[PDB]
From a paper:
In particular, one intensely studied protein, Legionella effector DrrA (Defect in Rab1 recruitment A, also referred to as SidM, substrate of Icm/Dot), is secreted early during infection, and it manipulates the vesicular trafficking regulator Rab1 (Ras-related protein Rab-1). DrrA consists of three functional domains. The N-terminal domain possesses AMPylation activity (also referred to as adenylylation). AMPylation is a post-translational modification (PTM) in which an adenosine triphosphate (ATP) is utilised in order to transfer adenosine monophosphate (AMP) to hydroxyl-bearing amino acid side chains.
Therefore, we also generated the TReND-1-linked complex with the GTPase domain of the close Rab1b-homologue Rab8a (amino acids 6−176; Rab8a6-176). In order to obtain insight into the molecular basis of DrrA substrate recognition, we determined the crystal structure of the DrrA16-352:TReND-1:Rab8a6-176 complex bound to GppNHp at 2.1 Å resolution (DrrA16-352:TReND-1:Rab8a6-176 will be referred to as DrrA:Rab8a hereafter for clarity). The complex binding mode observed in the crystal structure was unexpected since the Rab molecule does not interact with the catalytic centre of DrrA16-352 constituted by the catalytically important residues D110DrrA and D112DrrA13. Instead, Rab8a:GppNHp binds to a surface patch opposite the catalytic centre that we refer to as the non-conventional (NC) Rab binding site (RBS), hereafter referred to as NC-RBS. In the DrrA:Rab8a complex structure, switch I (E30Rab8a, F33Rab8a and N34Rab8a), the interswitch region (D44Rab8a and K58Rab8a), and switch II (Q60Rab8a and R69Rab8a) of Rab8a mainly interact with the N-terminal half of the ATPase domain of DrrA opposite the catalytic motif, centred at amino acids R70DrrA, Q71DrrA and K74DrrA. Based on the structures of other ATases belonging to the DNA polymerase β-like enzyme family, the catalytic motif of DrrA is expected to be G98-S99-L100-X11-D110-X-D112DrrA, with D110DrrA and D112DrrA involved in coordinating the essential magnesium ion. In contrast to the previous DrrA8-218 fragment structure, the position of D110DrrA and D112DrrA is well defined and the residues appear to be capable of Mg2+ coordination. The covalently bound TReND-1 is well defined in the electron density in the complex crystal structure. The structure of free Rab8a:GppNHp superimposes very well with Rab8a in the NC-RBS-complex, with an RMSD of 0.38 Å, indicating that binding of Rab8a to DrrA does not result in global structural changes in Rab8a. Indeed, upon Rab binding, helix α3 may be pulled into the protein core, and D110DrrA (β2), D112DrrA (β2) and D150DrrA (α4−α5 loop) move together so that the active Mg2+ coordinating function of these amino acid residues can be fulfilled.
Numbering used by the authors:
A (entry chain A): 3 to 175
B (entry chain B): 14 to 352
Write the structure that this text describes.
C-alpha cells in the first residue's frame, strides 16, 4: 500500500507467443490454456519488494495483432522496462525479435531496460528455436535472456523481478 | 425502405446491407466461438465466467475501435470506458446485460464521442434481438446515457438527473476500466465517497446490512428460490462490505471479483480462513449453477428448486450471522469502551 517507485513495464511480441499468459501467471499465479487475443492494450498492477522498497509494477500487455501497432508503439516512450517475448515452438516469432528490437531502438526511451523471453519452454517436443540460439541473439544485443513457461510456471517470477532489479539499479545511481 | 448500415437502428432498418451483414455475423461468430471455447476447455483453472468476461471485454473493445474507424472519429486519449454490474466483477453469464459508461476529461469530447456510442448501442441492441445477449439497458448503465466529465456524472447523482441515485452510485463504485485509463474513474468515485449526503449509503455497515436485511433468506416451506436474490446478491454485498472495511483496491479492478477480494483477504489475513473458504465455496457453487441455468435457457433464468439450493442457502445463513457480528464490531469499534 506504501509505494517507493512506480515501474511502467511493457510486454511486446508476435500474437500467440504468450504475453497475456506470462502476465496472468505473474499477476494471478494461474495458466489459461485458451487463446483470447488481446485488443489494443491491457494492464495489470502488482506491487513487489526489492531492497526493502515497495515497487508498484504497472504492466502494459500489448496486442501482437499488426492492426494495433500504431496504438502499441505510442507506449514504448513511457516504458521503463520492456519484455520481448517469442515462442520457442515458432521460428517465425524468434526471427521477428530483431524487428521488435529495432522498433524499441526507434520509439523507446534511450536508457530503457530490455529482456528477451523465450516462452512455452515446457513444449520441448515442438521446439523450433534451440535455447543457445536465443542466448546467442540476446548476447549479440547485450540484452538479458530467459526461457519462460506460463504453463509450467518456469522463470516467470524471476524474469519480472530481474527486469525490475535492472530498472531499480539504473535509477538508484 | 432501404438497407441499414452496421450502426443503423434495427426498428428503422430491419435488414443490413450485404457489407454490414458480413460484419454483424463476424461479431455473432466471436460470441459463439467464445461460448464454444468455454465448453471445450471444461475443468480449466480459469472459471467459465472469468473466461467469458475476458473474451467479451476483447470483443467489446474491438467493436469500439471498429466504430471509431467506421464513423471517421478519432478516439480521445483522455476518454475512459468502464464496465459496471456482473461484468465489472467478472461474474456475468453469457445472457447477462452489457453495462458500460464513458468518462471524458473535457465536456466538448461528449459532442465528438456520443455519436460513436449511440452507433454502438444500435449494434448491441441488434445483437440482443438476435441472440438475447449484451443487452444495452436504455434506462440503465449504457455509454450513451452515462457519458461526461467526473463533475457531470457526480452532478447527475447529487441532483435528480437520474432515477435510483443509489443503484447508479453502486454501478460507478463497482466499475472496472476497459482501457488502461482509470484516473477519471478514481476522481468520480472519490467525489461520490466525499459527498456528505451519500455518507452512509457508501459505508461498509450499509453493504453488510443489505446482505443481512434487504436480500433476506427464502420464506419457510418455499419450493422455488433465486440463485440471484437469495445467494449471489447477499455474497456480492458481503464482499463490498469487506472491500470497504479493509480499503481493498486495484487500479485494474482486480479487487472487484470474488476471487480478487478472497486473494486479498488471504494475503493480509484480514478474515479467518474458515470464513473466507465458506464465501469462496458458495460463490463457486452459485456461479456454476447460475452460468449453467442461463446457458441452458439462453436467457436470465435464476429460479431453481429449494432442494437443489439447500446446501448453499445454509452456508449463506452462516455468512449472514458473520455479517451481523461485523456490523456490531464496527459499531463497537467507533465507541471504543476502555477499562
Ligand atoms: N504450452 C504453453 N502454452 C502457452 C504458454 N503461454 C501461453 N500459451 C498458450 O499460447 C496461446 C496464446 O497465449 P496468449 O497469452 O493469449 O498470447 P499473446 O501473446 O497474449 N497473444 P496476443 O498478442 O494475440 O494477445 C494460448 O493458447 C495459451 O494457452 C506457455 O508457457 N506454454
Ligand atoms: O530454465 C530452465 C529451463 O531450460 C529449458 O528452457 C527447458 O526447456 C525448461 O523446461 C527448463 O525449466
Ligand atoms: O453483480 C452486480 C452487483 O453489483 C453491485 O453489488 C450492485 O449493488 C448489485 O446490482 C449486484 O450485487
Ligand atoms: O476503498 C476500496 C473501495 O473503494 C471504492 O468503494 C471502490 O468502488 C471499491 O470497489 C473498493 O473496494
Ligand atoms: Mg494477449
Amino acid at each position: 500500500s506504501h509505494m517507493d517507485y512506480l515501474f511502467k513495464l511493457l510486454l511486446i511480441g508476435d500474437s500467440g507467443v504468450g504475453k497475456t499468459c506470462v502476465l496472468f501467471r505473474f499477476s494471478e499465479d494461474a495458466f489459461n490454456s485458451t487463446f483470447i487475443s488481446t485488443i489494443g492494450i491491457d494492464f495489470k498492477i502488482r506491487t513487489i519488494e526489492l531492497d526493502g522498497k515497495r515497487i508498484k509494477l504497472q504492466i502494459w500487455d500489448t496486442a501482437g495483432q499488426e492492426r494495433f501497432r500504431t496504438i502499441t508503439t505510442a507506449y514504448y516512450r513511457g516504458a521503463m522496462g520492456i519484455m520481448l517475448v517469442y515462442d520457442i515452438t515458432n521460428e517465425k516469432s524468434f526471427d521477428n525479435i530483431r524487428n521488435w528490437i529495432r522498433n524499441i531502438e526507434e520509439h523507446a526511451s534511450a536508457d530503457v531496460e530490455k529482456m528477451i523471453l523465450g516462452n512455452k519452454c515446457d513444449v520441448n517436443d515442438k521446439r523450433q528455436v534451440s535455447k543457445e540460439r536465443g542466448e546467442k541473439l540476446a548476447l549479440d544485443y547485450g540484452i538479458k535472456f530467459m526461457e519462460t513457461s506460463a504453463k509450467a510456471n518456469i522463470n516467470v517470477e524471476n524474469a519480472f523481478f530481474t527486469l525490475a532489479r535492472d530498472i531499480k539499479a539504473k535509477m538508484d545511481k | 425502405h432501404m438497407f441499414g448500415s452496421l450502426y443503423s437502428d434495427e426498428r428503422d432498418k430491419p435488414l443490413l446491407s450485404p457489407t454490414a451483414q458480413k460484419k454483424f455475423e463476424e461479431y455473432q461468430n466471436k460470441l459463439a466461438n467464445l461460448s464454444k471455447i468455454i465448453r471445450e476447455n471444461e475443468g480449466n483453472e480459469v472459471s467459465p465466467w472469468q473466461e467469458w468476461e475476458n473474451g467479451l471485454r476483447q470483443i467489446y473493445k474491438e467493436m469500439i475501435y471498429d466504430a471509431f474507424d467506421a464513423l471517421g472519429v478519432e478516439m480521445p486519449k483522455d476518454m475512459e470506458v468502464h464496465f459496471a454490474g456482473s461484468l465489472a466483477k467478472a461474474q456475468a453469464t453469457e445472457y447477462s446485460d452489457l453495462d458500460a459508461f464513458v468518462i471524458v476529461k473535457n465536456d466538448e469530447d461528449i459532442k465528438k464521442v456520443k455519436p460513436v456510442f449511440d452507433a454502438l448501442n444500435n449494434l448491441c441492441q441488434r445483437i440482443f434481438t438476435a441472440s438475447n445477449q449484451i443487452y444495452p439497458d436504455p434506462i440503465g448503465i449504457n455509454p450513451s446515457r452515462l457519458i461526461g466529465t467526473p463533475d457531470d456524472l457526480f452532478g447527475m447523482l447529487k441532483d435528480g438527473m437520474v432515477a435510483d441515485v443509489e443503484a447508479t452510485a453502486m454501478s460507478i463504485l463497482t466499475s472496472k476500466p476497459v482501457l488502461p485509463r482509470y484516473e477519471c474513474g478514481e476522481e468520480l468515485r472519490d467525489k461520490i465517497k466525499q459527498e456528505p449526503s451519500f455518507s452512509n449509503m457508501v459505508s461498509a455497515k450499509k453493504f453488510y446490512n443489505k446482505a443481512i436485511k434487504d436480500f433476506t433468506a427464502p420464506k419457510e416451506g418455499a419450493e422455488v428460490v433465486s440463485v440471484k436474490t437469495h445467494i449471489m446478491r447477499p455474497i456480492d454485498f458481503m464482499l463490498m462490505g469487506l472491500r470497504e472495511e479493509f480499503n481493498l483496491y486495484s487500479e485494474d479492478g482486480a479487487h472487484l471479483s470474488a476471487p480478487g477480494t478472497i486473494r486479498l483477504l488471504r494475503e493480509k489475513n484480514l478474515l479467518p480462513e474458515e470464513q473466507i473458504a465458506r464465501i469462496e465455496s458458495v460463490y463457486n457453487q452459485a456461479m456454476s449453477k447460475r452460468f449453467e441455468l442461463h446457458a441452458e435457457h439462453k436467457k436470465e433464468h435464476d429460479e431453481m428448486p429449494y432442494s437443489d439450493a439447500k446446501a448453499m442457502l445454509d452456508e449463506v445463513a452462516k455468512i449472514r450471522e458473520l455479517g451481523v457480528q461485523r456490523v456490531t464490531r464496527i459499531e463497537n469499534l467507533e465507541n471504543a469502551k476502555k477499562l
